[PDB]
Structure 1
Amino acid sequence: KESIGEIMGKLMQGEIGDEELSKRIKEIFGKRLQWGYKPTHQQQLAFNLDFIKSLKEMDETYELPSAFLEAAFGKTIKQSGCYFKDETTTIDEAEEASHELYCERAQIKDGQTVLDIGCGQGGLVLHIAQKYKNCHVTGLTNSKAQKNYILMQAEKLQLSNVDVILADVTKHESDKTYDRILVIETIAHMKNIQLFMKKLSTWMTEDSLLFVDHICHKTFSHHFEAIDEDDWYSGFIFPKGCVTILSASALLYFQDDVTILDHWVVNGMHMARSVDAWRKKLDKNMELAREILLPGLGSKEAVNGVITHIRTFCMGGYEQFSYNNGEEWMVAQMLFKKK
C-alpha cells in the first residue's frame, strides 16, 4: 500500500497488525543502512567527516502524567537503554544494572559532587544519592514535572543529598563546578555539540570526569528524518526534525575542550529488550493507561493517538536496535577529562 497518508490512516485504526508493522519499519531501517555504508573506507571517512563538519557549522506544554509513565516504564521510569544480563531479566533489574554500569564506568566514588544533565525522572540521580550518601547529586532538567517528581521521590526515600536545577542546559550559566558530570542519552537532542561540550568543560576542574552515553550507529552518523517519501515512520515519531544519531566514534572529533580517556559500546540488543519491555508493559496495562490519559487529553481518540505514537516508537525501536543481532544501532559511551 503506497502513500504516507494511507499507511498513517490504517495505523491509527489499529488495522495494521504487529507483524506487518515490524516488517515495514525494518525495511525503512534497511534503506538507511544502504544510505550510510560506503564501498571503501576512503569514502566512508569522507562521508563521516562531512557530517561532522556540518555539525560544527550549526549555531510543547503537554507532558504525560507520571501515573501513565509508571504504567509503561520500569520502576524508576528510566527512559534510556537498560542492561539485560539474562533472558528473564526484568525491566526493573535491567534499570538497576545499567545504573551500576554508569557508576562503574564514570568512576563514581563516595564524597564527589555529581551533575546529571537531562536527568529525566531522576532514576540515576536517586541511585547515586542512595548508594553514596556523602555524594551531593544535582539533576538538571528543562521539565518542571520532572523536577517535582524527583524531589518527591527523594523525600520518600529519605535522601538529603539531592537537588534539581530547572533549566534549558543550552542557556544555563553558572560558576559551579562538579567532580562528575553524566550525560545519559541527552546528546541526541543537542543542536550545537561543540558548544555543548565547551560549556560542560567550564563546569569541570582538572580532577573532574565527564561520562556520556548516546544512541549511535556503529559506522555512520545520521539525522533521524525521512530519506524518501516511502518513510512515514521518522516524521511520525519525531515530528520536529531535530534528533541526530551520531556514529559510535563521532564524539572523538569533539575534543576541543575535553580529552577522551575511555570509550565503549553496548550491543543494541540491550536497547531492543528495553523498548520491548516497555511495549509489553504498556500492552498489559492498556485499559488503565487509557483511563489515566483521558482527563488531560479530552477525547478517547486523542488518547488512542498518544498510545499509538508510543507503541509504534517501541515497535520501531525494536526493529532498529535488534538489526543484525544488535550490531548496527547501539549505545556508545565515552569518558573524558577537561583539556
Structure 2
Amino acid sequence: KAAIVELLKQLELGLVPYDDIKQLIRRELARRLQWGYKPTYEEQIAEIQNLTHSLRQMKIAPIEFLKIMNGSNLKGSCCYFKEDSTTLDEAEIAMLDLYCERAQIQDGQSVLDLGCGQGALTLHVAQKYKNCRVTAVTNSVSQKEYIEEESRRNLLNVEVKLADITTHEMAETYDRILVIELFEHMKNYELLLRKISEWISKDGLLFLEHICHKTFAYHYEPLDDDDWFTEYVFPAGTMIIPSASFFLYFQDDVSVVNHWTLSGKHFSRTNEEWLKRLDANLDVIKPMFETLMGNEEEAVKLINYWRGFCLSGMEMFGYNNGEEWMASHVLFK
C-alpha cells in the first residue's frame, strides 16, 4: 500500500509523465485480463452465471468546465469515430445519429431518455423530431436545470423529470426508451429491467448502450492489494463491468431484437480528445477550479483527477487495439 499511496500522491500533483502513467495502467489491465480469462469455456460461462445469479439477490441501487472538455453537444459518454480525421464534435453527432438509427426513432413518437446526463441525446432527438415528445430523467438538480434552460432554443417538446429511477414509479408509456451507459451504476438488472419494461408501450423498444469486456463480467472491485487502478477514478463498488453478452441473461421482461458491439478505439479516442481539451485549456481551468475549490493545491489535484479519468478511458478501451474493453449496443422489444 505505501508504494501505492506514494504513487497516488505523485499522480495528484501531476508529477508523473503520461508515458509512465499509461505503462502502469497497462500493467494493471494485463492483470485484469489474466484474472478475467479462464482455461476452460465451462468456467468462463460459469463465472457469468455466478455474477448474474447474485445480482439477482441484490437491490437495484460545473457547466463551464464541461463546455471546455466535451464537444459542443456535451455528450459525456462514448463518441463515434469513423475515419482517422474525425473530430470530437463530429464524433458526438455521429454517435447521436447512430442511436437514432439503431433505436429506430420516428417523428411522432414519445421518447424517454433514462439517465440523460446533460442531456445531449434528449436535446438531439427533440430538435431532429419536432413531433416527438421527449422526456429526460435525472436525479441531478443541476442537470435538470440545464436541459430545461437549454430547451430554449425554442424546443416545446422536451420535459425533464427529477427522479431516482431506483425507486421511481410512473403511469406513462413510451414508444422508445433509451438508456446510455446507466446500468454500469446499477446492480439488480432483473428488477431494473422489470421497472423500465412497464414503461415501454407494447410495440415500443428499449435501446441500451453499456461498456463491457467482450468475454468476462465483474464487480469493478480492486483485483488485490496493489491494484491502484480500479479505484483511481471511481470508488469501489459503485460500478459493474458487464460482458458483451451480459444482458442477454436478463430477458424476463424484455426480448433482444438486435445486438451490436463497437470497438474500444471509439471510447479510447473520445477520452483522448477530452484530455487534449483539458491540457490545452489549463489557463482558464485552473483559475476556475481555484475559485470553485479553496486553494491552489486542491485545484491542482482536481485537474489530475480529470487527467486520470481520461487516461483510464484511453488505455482501458484502447487496450489490444480496442479488442478487449468496448461498447455494446442492445435493442429490446
For normalisation by structure 1, the TM-score amounts to 0.95
Of stretches 254-263 and 49-58 in structure 1, the one that deviates more from structure 2 is 49-58
AA of the residue aligned to 1:107 = Q
What residue in structure 1 maps to residue 298 of structure 2?
302
Q: What root-mean-square deviation, in Å, do the aligned CA atoms of Structure 1 and Structure 2 show? A: 1.2
In structure 2, the partner of 1:149 is: 146
1:237 aligns to 2:233 (yes or no): yes
Quote the Cα distance in structure 1 between the aligned partners of 2:139 and 2:14: 34
1:62 corresponds to: none
What does the per-residue CA deviation read over 1:161-182, in whole Å, with 9 as the maximum and x for residues that have no partner?
1110011111111001110000
Aligned counterparts of 2:188 and 2:304: Cα–Cα separation in 1: 31
User: 2:113: which partner in 1?
Assistant: 116
- Kindly report structure 1 stretches of 4+ aligned residues shifted beyond 6 Å: none
Q: Give the distance between the partners of 1:299 and 1:167, measured in 2 at CA.
A: 34
State the number of aligned residues: 331
* 1:256 CA drift (Å): 0.7
Query: For the residues of structure 1 that align with 2:119 and 2:46, how far apart are their CA atoms?
Result: 39
Q: How far did residue 85 of structure 1 move?
A: 1.2
Distance between the aligned counterparts of 1:280 and 1:225, measured in 2? 29
- Partner amino acid, structure 1, of 2:113: D
The answer to whether residue 185 in structure 2 is matched with residue 227 in structure 1 is no
TM-score (norm 2): 0.97
Structure 2 unaligned spans of 5+: none
1:151-300 alignment runs, 5 A limit: 151-155=148-152, 157-300=153-296
CA distance in 1, matches of 2:192, 2:277: 35
State the 1:31 CA deviation.
Answer: 0.5
Specify the alignment match of 2:131 in structure 1: 134
1:86 Cα deviation from its structure 2 partner: 1.5
Pairing partner for 2:68 from 42, 66, 71: 71
Whether the 8 Å CA contact 1:235–1:241 is kept in 2: the answer is no
Distance between the aligned counterparts of 1:9 and 1:263, measured in 2?
Answer: 42
The reply on whether 1:14 has 2:14 as its aligned counterpart is yes
Q: Counterpart of 1:101? A: 98
Distance in 1, matches of 2:9 and 2:107, equals 54
CA distance in 1, matches of 2:290, 2:2: 33
Is the deviation greater in 284-293 or in 124-133? 284-293
Cα offset for 1:105? Answer: 0.3
Amino acid at match of 2:138: T
**Using the alignment, how far apart are the partners of 1:282 and 1:113 within structure 2?**
37
Q: List alignment gaps of at least 5 residues for structure 1.
A: 60-64
Which letter does structure 1 place at the counterpart of 2:110?
T
- The aligned amino acid for 2:185 is H
Partners of 1:224 and 1:309 lie apart in 2 by 18
Mapped contact 1:26–1:316 kept (Cα < 8 A): no
Matched residue SS, 1:4: helix
Residue type at the aligned position of 2:17: G
Per the TM alignment, residue 229 of structure 1 is displaced from its structure 2 partner at its CA by 1.5
Instruction: Quote how far apart the aligned CAs of 1:76 are.
Output: 1.3
Give the Cα–Cα distance (whole angstroms) in 2 for the partners of residues 191 and 77 of structure 1: 27
**Kept in 2: contact 1:191–1:242 (CA 8 A):** no
- Partner residue, 1:50: 50
